[model samples]
Target chain A: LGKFSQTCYNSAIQGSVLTSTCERTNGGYNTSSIDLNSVIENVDGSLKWQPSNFIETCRNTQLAGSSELAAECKTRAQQFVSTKINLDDHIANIDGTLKYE
Target chain B: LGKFSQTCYNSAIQGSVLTSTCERTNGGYNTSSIDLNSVIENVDGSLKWQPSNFIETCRNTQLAGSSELAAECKTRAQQFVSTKINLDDHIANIDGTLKYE
Candidate 1:
């Protein structure tokens, strides 16, 4: 359990940093910052998408608990989604680059 | 990039809920809440430990970014570590239970 929490905590901190770096790197021109891209790509390419699913499982079940915790979880999840937009925007740019460039 | 951010955001929210559940369950008797324990075990048992390493990589590199973000990352990481301790305390109780029960 400790190991798991550490993993999540670390991941969250890392995610925050990666998203922040992505923003700093391109000033929104590249929503998909290299650092953020690397984080997800590494999960998919190296971990075979396990972390992706694990997080999903956690997110899905968070509401099964107390309301305060549930609300907290909801807020954090919203932030997570917002950060994902940055990544999504970046991907869109990359797709555009590939298609038009 | 968006997908990745969503993943992290969702994961963080999930983690918060899991930890909170662990707290709510035992009132500290079981610091290692069933939910949190289940979360980590699932990661280890199912994911083959990939998320563990992925998060480590992220936490380690977080400090390499801008100072403000770095500070935020540090605070989040600290919270993560604190949650891990709850799990650790629970594990200790489990061990004691096994030994005494």
Candidate 2:
């Protein structure tokens, strides 16, 4: 289904200087691009923010606690960010297929 | 229908001096009799304790605000009591219906 000029000429124009400038100048990059690329690179790594690390930090109360606090803070911060992202998508669909729970 | 004595002569010994003191000799009274009989006689009497009335006593500001503390304590106590009565019932219902996620 891919139509081409049978050479890099067609793709050259597609990825040309104009297209390169158009992509970067127009702010077309998504921050989620990092997340998608991370998934592609490391399939075994956790995409979930760890809460157990906070419990461990609490146990290690004398270590200046940066990692433990960082995990907790990261989760709470992501909660607000997720809520903002889903605000417009929060309305009930009423089709019984919407999995709100 | 209950059989009745033919006259005061036959029923006289049943309720006479013997029956009057016979009831007191039997230790058949229940403490719950007081609550049940009170409702039986008055029909409008309350069997449950008044929670709002107890909260009013918390007005003694320096007594650790016992009245306000009591209302909060009262809820906790009631929650524990309710849990105890329904603990087994709750576990039975939760047996196959648990959704830990």
Candidate 3:
């Protein structure tokens, strides 16, 4: 969760305003204004830093030189990111259920 | 297992002799000649592709810049590789025990 968030908010760390914004959005301090896009843009140029895109970038850019290895890395990265995302969502759903039940 | 073996025998593909040797050693065709050395050497020159060393390389060489992010990537990479290795070992142990029992 932290690593994925870090990838999104890396650019925001450069400035105070952006840092504060990212902190609120990512740290769950202010879920009401959760601007996931702010962090996603830092990871990729698109509004959505989807897991598939992140895996694609890792394959194409990070592990570009090695084709065979890149494929393996991509599969692993995709699994890791997706699992984490799912876990986060599950936890959030549980939290909401308990709070509003 | 395939990716790890590929890294090791990548150089061996140039000739038929090495390919056959790698196939036998990696494909579980010859358990007696299971030389992890051949693969380790390709990963690093120290004849030991230890998880720590592999993680170090992934951090230093693969993700040199962006220290914060590199640390995160290292953890992810380490967990991914170690889990895969452990799973492979467990499967091998099961196979061996069943064959001998």
Rank the models by DockQ, top first: 1, 3, 2
Per-candidate Cα RMSD to the true structure, in Å, reads 21.1, 36.9, 23.1
Off by over 4 Å in 1: A1-16, A20-51, A54-62, A67-101, B1-50, B55-101
List TM-score per model, in order. Answer: 0.19, 0.12, 0.13
DockQ for each numbered candidate: 0.06, 0.01, 0.02
DockQ of candidate 3 compared with the true complex = 0.02
lDDT of 2 by residue, A1-101 (tens): 11111110211111000000112223342110000110011112211111112222111111111111111112322321111112012211112111111
Q: Which ten residues in a row have the lowest lDDT in candidate 1 chain B?
A: B92-101
The TM-score of the first chain in every model comes to 0.16, 0.13, 0.16
Residue A92 of model 1 has an lDDT of 16
Worst 10 residues of 3 chain B by lDDT: B92-101
Give the candidate order by descending TM-score.
Answer: 1, 3, 2
Q: Write the per-residue lDDT of candidate 1 for residues B1-101, one digit (tens) a residue.
A: 31222221122234422221121222331112112211221232132112233344324333321221222112323332211111221111121121000
lDDT per model, in order?
0.23, 0.14, 0.19
What docking tier does model 2 reach?
A: incorrect
TM-score of 1: 0.19
Clashing pairs in 2: B58-B67
CAPRI-style grade of the A/B interface in model 1: incorrect
lDDT of 1 by residue, A1-101 (tens): 21122112112234422211121222332112112222221232132111233344334334321221222112333332211111122211121121000
